[PDB]
Design a protein around this ligand. Structure first.
Ligand SMILES: Nc1nc2c(ncn2[C@@H]2O[C@H](COP(=O)(O)OP(=O)(O)O)[C@@H](O)[C@H]2O)c(=O)[nH]1
Ligand SMILES: [Mg+2]
Length: 169
């Protein structure tokens, strides 16, 4: 077993908690306090190898920004989540990509771009815009719904594969 630190980032309300709780507890939680930051463990086998995932469901500002920097430094891979009906949340991805690279002082940081809430109407962020951005970063892009579970396992397990690829470089 190897333990991997995964960090779920994105604007408030994009579905970080709903995605994480789906993976951990296998249900859609409608209401989970937006101000709670917590971490969860889950063991899974990926490509024949047993992994312990230590997943941080972030909630934004910290008491001290030094704490944010620390979880970015210890985080091995990042799920960068936006909501497909919230253009601002998508534009914020530029900032997350920049910031994480800055804190880690690295050009090569495992990440997956996640466009969540794909079951909702009135999309404002086109799939193509997001695929273009992910391509520009060299990272995977997956659309998800924490409600239906579309893409949820794929997103987390793809991130583990990205972390492994980075480590085996
Ligand atoms: N319909 C739908 N609602 C979602 C989805 N993901 C999150 N939500 C809702 O969006 C709101 C914000 O979700 P939450 O997980 O608290 O977002 P966070 O602030 O990023 O942790 C909540 O009302 C959730 O019920 C999704 O994929 N589909
Ligand atoms: Mg939350």
């Amino acid at each position: 077993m190897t333990e991997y630190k995964l960090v779920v980032v994105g604007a408030g309300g994009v579905g970080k908690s709903a995605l994480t709780i789906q993976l951990i507890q296998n249900h859609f939680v409608d209401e989970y306090d937006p101000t709670i930051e917590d971490s969860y463990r889950k063991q899974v086998v990926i490509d024949g190898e047993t992994c312990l995932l230590d997943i941080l469901d972030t909630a934004g500002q910290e008491e001290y920004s030094a704490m944010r920097d620390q979880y970015m430094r210890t985080g091995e891979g990042f799920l960068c989540v936006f909501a497909i009906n919230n253009t601002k949340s998508f534009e914020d991805i530029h900032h997350y990509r920049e910031q994480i690279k800055r804190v880690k002082d690295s050009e090569d940081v495992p990440m997956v771009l996640v466009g969540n809430k794909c079951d909702l109407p009135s999309r404002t962020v086109d799939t193509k815009q997001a695929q273009d951005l992910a391509r520009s970063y060299g990272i995977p892009f997956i659309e998800t719904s924490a409600k239906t579970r579309q893409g949820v396992d794929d997103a987390f397990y793809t991130l583990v594969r990205e972390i492994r690829k980075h480590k085996e470089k």
